[PDB]
Coordinates of C-alpha atoms in Angstrom, one line a residue:
Chain F
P1 CA 35.4 126.4 109.9
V2 CA 34.0 125.7 113.5
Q3 CA 32.2 128.0 116.0
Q4 CA 31.5 126.7 119.5
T5 CA 28.4 128.2 121.3
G6 CA 27.5 128.0 125.1
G7 CA 26.7 124.6 126.5
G8 CA 29.6 122.9 124.5
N9 CA 27.7 123.0 121.3
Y10 CA 29.6 123.2 117.9
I11 CA 28.4 124.7 114.6
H12 CA 29.9 125.3 111.1
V13 CA 30.8 128.9 110.0
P14 CA 31.8 130.2 106.5
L15 CA 35.5 130.8 105.6
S16 CA 36.5 134.4 105.1
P17 CA 36.7 135.6 101.5
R18 CA 40.2 137.2 101.7
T19 CA 41.7 134.0 103.1
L20 CA 40.4 132.2 100.0
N21 CA 41.7 135.1 97.8
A22 CA 45.1 135.2 99.6
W23 CA 45.6 131.4 99.1
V24 CA 44.7 131.8 95.3
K25 CA 47.3 134.6 94.8
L26 CA 50.1 132.9 96.7
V27 CA 49.6 129.8 94.5
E28 CA 49.8 131.8 91.2
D29 CA 52.1 134.7 91.9
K30 CA 54.7 132.6 93.7
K31 CA 54.4 129.9 91.0
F32 CA 54.3 127.2 93.8
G33 CA 57.3 128.4 95.7
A34 CA 58.3 126.5 98.9
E35 CA 56.2 129.1 100.8
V36 CA 52.9 127.9 99.2
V37 CA 53.1 125.0 101.7
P38 CA 53.3 127.1 104.9
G39 CA 51.1 130.0 103.3
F40 CA 48.4 127.2 102.9
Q41 CA 48.8 126.1 106.7
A42 CA 48.4 129.6 108.2
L43 CA 45.4 130.6 106.0
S44 CA 43.9 127.1 106.7
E45 CA 45.0 127.1 110.3
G46 CA 42.1 125.8 112.5
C47 CA 39.5 125.3 109.6
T48 CA 37.3 122.3 108.5
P49 CA 37.9 120.2 105.4
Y50 CA 34.7 121.4 103.6
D51 CA 36.3 124.9 103.5
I52 CA 39.8 123.7 102.5
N53 CA 38.5 121.8 99.4
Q54 CA 36.8 125.1 98.4
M55 CA 40.1 127.1 98.6
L56 CA 41.9 124.4 96.5
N57 CA 38.8 124.4 94.2
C58 CA 38.8 128.3 93.8
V59 CA 42.1 128.3 91.8
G60 CA 42.0 127.7 88.0
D61 CA 45.7 128.0 86.9
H62 CA 48.5 125.5 87.7
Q63 CA 45.5 123.1 87.6
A64 CA 47.8 120.2 86.6
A65 CA 49.6 120.3 89.9
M66 CA 46.1 120.5 91.6
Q67 CA 45.5 117.0 89.9
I68 CA 48.7 115.7 91.4
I69 CA 47.6 116.9 94.9
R70 CA 44.1 115.2 94.4
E71 CA 45.9 111.8 93.6
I72 CA 48.2 112.0 96.8
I73 CA 45.1 112.6 99.0
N74 CA 43.3 109.5 97.7
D75 CA 46.4 107.4 98.5
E76 CA 46.6 108.7 102.1
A77 CA 42.9 107.8 102.6
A78 CA 43.7 104.3 101.2
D79 CA 46.4 103.8 103.9
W80 CA 44.1 105.3 106.5
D81 CA 41.5 102.5 105.8
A82 CA 44.3 99.8 105.9
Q83 CA 45.6 101.1 109.3
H84 CA 42.1 101.8 110.7
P85 CA 39.9 98.7 111.4
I86 CA 36.5 98.9 109.6
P87 CA 34.7 98.9 113.0
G88 CA 32.1 96.6 111.3
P89 CA 28.7 96.1 113.0
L90 CA 28.3 99.2 115.3
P91 CA 25.6 100.3 117.8
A92 CA 23.2 102.1 115.3
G93 CA 23.0 105.8 116.3
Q94 CA 26.8 106.0 117.1
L95 CA 28.7 108.6 115.1
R96 CA 30.5 106.5 112.5
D97 CA 34.4 106.5 113.1
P98 CA 35.3 108.6 110.1
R99 CA 36.8 106.6 107.2
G100 CA 39.2 107.8 104.4
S101 CA 37.1 110.2 102.4
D102 CA 35.5 111.3 105.7
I103 CA 38.8 113.0 106.7
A104 CA 39.1 114.5 103.2
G105 CA 35.4 115.3 103.7
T106 CA 34.2 114.4 100.1
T107 CA 31.9 111.6 101.3
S108 CA 30.9 113.4 104.6
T109 CA 29.0 116.5 105.7
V110 CA 30.7 119.5 107.6
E111 CA 28.7 118.9 110.8
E112 CA 29.9 115.3 111.4
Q113 CA 33.5 116.5 110.5
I114 CA 33.1 119.1 113.3
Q115 CA 31.5 116.3 115.5
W116 CA 34.5 114.0 115.0
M117 CA 36.9 117.0 115.7
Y118 CA 35.4 117.2 119.2
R119 CA 33.8 113.7 119.5
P120 CA 33.9 112.8 123.3
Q121 CA 34.1 109.0 122.5
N122 CA 37.1 109.1 120.0
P123 CA 37.6 112.6 118.6
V124 CA 39.1 112.3 114.9
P125 CA 40.7 115.7 114.1
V126 CA 39.8 115.6 110.4
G127 CA 41.3 119.0 109.7
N128 CA 45.0 118.6 110.6
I129 CA 45.3 115.1 108.8
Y130 CA 43.8 116.4 105.5
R131 CA 45.8 119.6 105.4
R132 CA 49.0 117.3 105.9
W133 CA 47.9 115.1 102.9
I134 CA 47.4 118.2 100.7
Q135 CA 50.8 119.6 102.0
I136 CA 52.6 116.5 100.7
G137 CA 51.0 116.9 97.2
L138 CA 52.0 120.7 97.3
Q139 CA 55.6 119.7 98.3
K140 CA 56.0 117.3 95.4
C141 CA 54.9 120.1 93.0
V142 CA 57.5 122.6 94.5
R143 CA 60.2 120.0 93.5
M144 CA 58.7 119.3 90.0
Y145 CA 58.3 123.1 89.3
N146 CA 61.7 124.1 90.7
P147 CA 63.5 125.5 87.7
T148 CA 67.1 124.4 88.4
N149 CA 68.9 122.1 91.0
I150 CA 71.5 122.4 93.8
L151 CA 74.3 120.5 91.8
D152 CA 73.8 122.7 88.7
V153 CA 73.5 125.9 90.9
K154 CA 77.1 127.5 90.3
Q155 CA 78.3 131.1 90.9
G156 CA 78.7 132.9 87.6
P157 CA 82.4 133.9 87.0
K158 CA 81.2 137.6 87.2
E159 CA 78.1 136.8 89.3
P160 CA 78.6 137.7 93.0
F161 CA 78.9 134.7 95.5
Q162 CA 76.0 135.8 97.7
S163 CA 73.5 135.7 94.8
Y164 CA 74.7 132.1 94.1
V165 CA 73.9 131.4 97.8
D166 CA 70.4 132.7 97.6
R167 CA 69.9 130.4 94.5
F168 CA 71.6 127.4 96.3
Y169 CA 69.7 127.4 99.6
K170 CA 66.2 128.2 97.9
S171 CA 66.9 124.9 96.0
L172 CA 68.3 123.0 99.0
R173 CA 64.8 123.9 100.4
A174 CA 62.7 123.3 97.3
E175 CA 64.4 119.9 97.0
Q176 CA 63.5 118.7 100.5
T177 CA 66.7 116.7 101.3
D178 CA 67.3 115.1 104.7
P179 CA 69.1 117.4 107.2
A180 CA 72.4 115.4 107.3
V181 CA 72.6 115.7 103.4
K182 CA 71.8 119.4 104.0
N183 CA 74.8 119.9 106.4
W184 CA 77.1 118.0 104.0
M185 CA 75.9 120.1 100.9
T186 CA 76.1 123.4 102.8
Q187 CA 79.6 122.6 104.3
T188 CA 81.0 121.4 100.9
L189 CA 79.0 121.9 97.7
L190 CA 78.7 125.8 98.2
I191 CA 82.5 125.8 97.8
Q192 CA 82.9 123.0 95.1
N193 CA 80.2 124.5 92.8
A194 CA 81.8 128.0 93.1
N195 CA 84.2 129.8 90.7
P196 CA 88.0 129.1 91.4
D197 CA 89.0 132.7 92.4
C198 CA 86.6 132.9 95.4
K199 CA 86.9 129.1 96.2
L200 CA 90.6 129.5 97.1
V201 CA 89.6 132.4 99.5
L202 CA 86.9 130.2 101.1
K203 CA 89.7 127.5 101.7
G204 CA 91.9 130.3 103.1
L205 CA 89.2 131.0 105.8
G206 CA 89.9 127.6 107.3
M207 CA 88.0 124.3 107.8
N208 CA 84.3 124.3 108.8
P209 CA 84.0 128.0 107.8
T210 CA 80.5 129.6 108.7
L211 CA 78.3 131.4 106.2
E212 CA 78.9 134.9 107.8
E213 CA 82.7 134.3 107.5
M214 CA 82.3 132.9 103.9
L215 CA 80.2 135.9 102.7
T216 CA 82.3 138.6 104.5
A217 CA 85.6 137.3 103.1
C218 CA 84.4 136.7 99.5
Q219 CA 82.7 140.1 99.5
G220 CA 83.8 142.0 96.4
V221 CA 86.0 139.2 94.9
Chain O
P1 CA 113.9 80.6 118.1
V2 CA 113.1 79.1 121.6
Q3 CA 110.3 76.7 122.8
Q4 CA 109.4 75.6 126.4
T5 CA 108.9 72.0 127.7
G6 CA 107.3 70.5 130.9
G7 CA 109.3 71.5 134.1
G8 CA 110.2 75.0 133.0
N9 CA 112.9 73.9 130.6
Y10 CA 113.7 75.6 127.1
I11 CA 114.9 74.2 123.7
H12 CA 115.6 75.5 120.2
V13 CA 112.9 75.6 117.3
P14 CA 114.9 76.8 114.3
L15 CA 113.7 79.7 112.1
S16 CA 111.6 78.1 109.4
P17 CA 112.7 78.0 105.7
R18 CA 109.8 79.9 104.1
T19 CA 110.3 82.8 106.6
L20 CA 114.0 83.0 105.5
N21 CA 112.9 82.9 101.8
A22 CA 110.6 85.9 102.5
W23 CA 113.5 87.9 104.1
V24 CA 115.6 87.0 100.9
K25 CA 112.6 88.2 98.7
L26 CA 112.2 91.5 100.6
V27 CA 116.1 92.2 100.1
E28 CA 116.3 91.0 96.5
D29 CA 113.3 93.0 95.2
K30 CA 113.3 96.1 97.4
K31 CA 117.2 96.1 97.1
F32 CA 117.9 97.1 100.8
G33 CA 115.0 99.6 100.7
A34 CA 113.5 101.3 103.8
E35 CA 111.0 98.4 104.3
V36 CA 113.8 95.9 104.6
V37 CA 114.3 97.3 108.2
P38 CA 110.8 96.4 109.5
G39 CA 110.3 93.1 107.5
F40 CA 113.5 91.9 109.3
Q41 CA 112.2 92.9 112.8
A42 CA 109.0 91.0 112.4
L43 CA 110.5 87.8 110.7
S44 CA 113.0 87.8 113.6
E45 CA 110.4 88.0 116.5
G46 CA 110.9 85.0 118.9
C47 CA 114.2 84.0 117.1
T48 CA 117.7 84.0 118.5
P49 CA 121.0 85.5 117.1
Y50 CA 122.2 82.2 115.5
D51 CA 119.0 82.4 113.3
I52 CA 119.5 86.1 112.7
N53 CA 122.9 85.2 111.3
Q54 CA 121.3 82.5 109.1
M55 CA 118.9 85.1 107.6
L56 CA 121.9 87.5 106.8
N57 CA 123.9 84.5 105.5
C58 CA 121.2 83.6 102.9
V59 CA 121.5 87.2 101.6
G60 CA 125.4 87.2 102.1
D61 CA 125.8 87.6 98.3
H62 CA 125.1 91.3 98.7
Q63 CA 128.5 92.4 100.1
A64 CA 128.7 96.2 100.1
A65 CA 125.7 96.3 102.3
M66 CA 126.8 93.3 104.5
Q67 CA 130.2 95.1 105.0
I68 CA 128.4 98.2 106.4
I69 CA 126.2 96.0 108.8
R70 CA 129.3 93.9 109.9
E71 CA 131.2 97.1 110.8
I72 CA 128.4 98.4 113.0
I73 CA 127.9 95.1 115.0
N74 CA 131.6 95.0 115.9
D75 CA 131.4 98.6 117.3
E76 CA 128.3 98.2 119.4
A77 CA 129.8 95.0 120.9
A78 CA 133.0 96.9 121.8
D79 CA 130.8 99.6 123.6
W80 CA 128.9 96.8 125.4
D81 CA 132.3 95.4 126.5
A82 CA 133.4 98.9 127.6
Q83 CA 130.3 99.8 129.7
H84 CA 129.8 96.1 130.8
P85 CA 133.4 95.0 131.4
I86 CA 134.4 91.5 132.6
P87 CA 133.0 91.4 136.2
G88 CA 136.2 89.5 137.2
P89 CA 137.4 85.9 137.2
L90 CA 134.4 83.6 136.5
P91 CA 133.3 81.2 139.4
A92 CA 133.1 77.7 137.6
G93 CA 129.9 75.5 137.3
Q94 CA 127.9 78.3 135.6
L95 CA 127.5 80.1 132.3
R96 CA 129.9 83.2 131.7
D97 CA 128.3 86.6 131.5
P98 CA 127.5 87.6 127.9
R99 CA 130.2 89.4 125.9
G100 CA 129.8 91.6 122.8
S101 CA 130.4 88.8 120.2
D102 CA 128.0 86.3 122.0
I103 CA 125.1 88.8 121.5
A104 CA 126.0 88.5 117.8
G105 CA 126.2 84.6 117.9
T106 CA 129.7 84.3 116.3
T107 CA 131.6 83.0 119.4
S108 CA 128.6 81.6 121.2
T109 CA 126.2 78.7 120.8
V110 CA 122.3 79.1 120.8
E111 CA 121.9 77.2 124.1
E112 CA 124.0 79.7 126.0
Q113 CA 122.2 82.6 124.1
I114 CA 118.8 80.9 125.3
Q115 CA 120.1 80.4 128.9
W116 CA 120.7 84.2 129.1
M117 CA 117.5 85.0 127.3
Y118 CA 115.8 82.9 130.0
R119 CA 118.3 83.3 133.0
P120 CA 116.2 83.4 136.2
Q121 CA 118.7 85.6 138.1
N122 CA 119.4 88.2 135.4
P123 CA 118.2 87.3 131.9
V124 CA 120.0 89.2 129.1
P125 CA 117.9 89.7 126.0
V126 CA 120.8 88.6 123.6
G127 CA 118.4 88.2 120.7
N128 CA 116.7 91.7 120.6
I129 CA 120.0 93.6 121.2
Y130 CA 121.7 92.1 118.1
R131 CA 118.6 92.8 115.8
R132 CA 118.9 96.4 116.8
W133 CA 122.7 96.5 115.9
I134 CA 121.8 94.9 112.6
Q135 CA 118.9 97.4 112.0
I136 CA 121.4 100.4 112.3
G137 CA 123.5 98.7 109.5
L138 CA 120.4 98.1 107.3
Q139 CA 119.2 101.7 107.9
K140 CA 122.6 103.2 106.8
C141 CA 122.4 101.2 103.5
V142 CA 119.0 102.7 102.8
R143 CA 120.4 106.2 103.1
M144 CA 123.5 105.2 101.1
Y145 CA 121.2 103.9 98.2
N146 CA 118.5 106.6 98.6
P147 CA 118.1 107.8 94.9
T148 CA 116.7 111.4 95.7
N149 CA 117.5 114.0 98.3
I150 CA 114.4 115.8 99.7
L151 CA 115.4 119.3 98.5
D152 CA 115.2 118.0 94.8
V153 CA 111.7 116.4 95.5
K154 CA 109.0 118.8 94.0
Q155 CA 105.4 118.6 92.7
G156 CA 104.5 118.0 89.0
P157 CA 102.7 121.1 87.9
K158 CA 99.6 118.9 87.2
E159 CA 100.7 116.5 89.9
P160 CA 98.7 116.7 93.2
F161 CA 99.9 117.5 96.8
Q162 CA 99.2 113.8 98.1
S163 CA 101.7 112.0 95.8
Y164 CA 104.3 114.8 96.2
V165 CA 103.8 114.5 100.0
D166 CA 104.2 110.7 99.7
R167 CA 107.5 111.0 97.7
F168 CA 108.7 113.9 100.1
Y169 CA 108.1 111.8 103.2
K170 CA 109.5 108.5 101.7
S171 CA 112.9 110.3 101.4
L172 CA 112.6 112.1 104.8
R173 CA 112.2 108.5 106.4
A174 CA 115.3 107.1 104.7
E175 CA 117.2 110.5 105.4
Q176 CA 117.0 109.9 109.1
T177 CA 118.6 113.4 109.7
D178 CA 117.0 114.5 113.1
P179 CA 113.3 114.8 114.2
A180 CA 113.6 118.6 114.5
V181 CA 115.0 119.1 111.0
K182 CA 112.1 116.9 109.9
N183 CA 109.5 119.3 111.6
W184 CA 111.1 122.3 109.8
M185 CA 111.2 120.4 106.4
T186 CA 107.6 119.0 106.8
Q187 CA 106.1 122.5 107.6
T188 CA 108.2 124.4 105.0
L189 CA 110.2 122.5 102.3
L190 CA 106.9 120.8 101.4
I191 CA 105.2 124.2 100.7
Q192 CA 108.3 125.8 99.2
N193 CA 109.1 123.0 96.7
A194 CA 105.4 122.7 95.8
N195 CA 104.0 124.5 92.7
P196 CA 102.4 128.0 93.3
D197 CA 98.7 127.0 92.5
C198 CA 98.4 124.8 95.7
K199 CA 100.9 127.0 97.7
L200 CA 98.5 129.9 97.6
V201 CA 96.0 127.6 99.4
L202 CA 98.7 126.1 101.7
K203 CA 99.3 129.7 102.7
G204 CA 95.6 130.5 103.1
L205 CA 95.3 127.6 105.5
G206 CA 97.3 129.8 108.0
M207 CA 100.6 129.5 109.9
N208 CA 101.8 126.0 111.3
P209 CA 99.2 124.3 109.1
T210 CA 99.0 120.5 110.1
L211 CA 99.3 117.8 107.3
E212 CA 95.7 116.7 107.9
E213 CA 94.7 120.3 107.0
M214 CA 97.2 120.7 104.2
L215 CA 96.0 117.6 102.4
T216 CA 92.2 118.3 103.0
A217 CA 92.5 121.8 101.7
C218 CA 94.5 121.0 98.6
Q219 CA 92.3 118.0 97.5
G220 CA 91.4 119.0 93.9
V221 CA 93.5 122.2 93.9
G222 CA 95.4 121.7 90.6

């Protein structure tokens, strides 16, 4: 990561072992749940790209998804170059405006990544941008790995309604739908994909019922 | 109908032929159905009583229905005469005040009917009054011919609430009854004559459910 000493000077520091270990376990034990995206952000919060790559390169299982993440990052760097003018001839001795693989950090050293993060001329915060690219790759995997889907999620006849809800929302989250679609699905598809006995009761509650009211009333049906 | 010319004068522009044909087509096909009442009102907008009598004459072949309408017009005119009696002897050099049969157009010419329709001192809308008298005659025919009383109307077991509501209201319209009886029927007889599957839900909705909430809740129920 980054350690700033007196005088405004910046230096590189190692990334703690447990943070690397905790990231590895979250990826494997949770089988890339939808919490492997935020779990990555907190553990990587305020760190440099050189140490992130390591965390992603210290995991050996679910390696196929890691290949997907690598491809997404390359594409973000491609667009970065398209939207960032190659400065061209530059005063020699001027820190090079970091390019695409200089945000990922593959073609660059940690010190200049720290120097861009706090560059007085035009600081390029390499860390937040790269974590975001990786997050998009992680999010695609959550959707690809998701076992079922919201439409096929349906309360078992003997299954309780609340269990069906835990399955429904976890998938309304794993499948990252736009908020408006989310409101429509939550207001309607939680009643339509249910069993008929409880569905009538959910209709009896009244229009625009709320989840508290829906769970309380269908409790024990 | 009536047209205006330079100077503030008025003339007659007869009801057109293809407008009369449409009135005939609505009566022959719908057979004095409920829609015959509004079709007439619209095809008669801007027209005068003489032309309303032509429209009825083209469909004069129907006689049981035209006997009911004819009876009503005579009555309303008599009431007009009773509550608007002859003011007294008529000063000469002017048009008489309208009598009940003039509103009909039987004893009166169109020009006199137009002079009242556009009389500066006190214009009498001879045209609209007669259409209303005729509409009460047409409405009675609809109720006479209505094939189904609302109490019999029910929902097919696999039939939905929407079509059943459509049929239940169709009859309630033709069965003018009174607006209050309609409220009791629309909030109860609909649920009572329904099947039990959607009634359970119509009961879950709550008390005094509105139609908007009775139709939304029972969409797909059964």
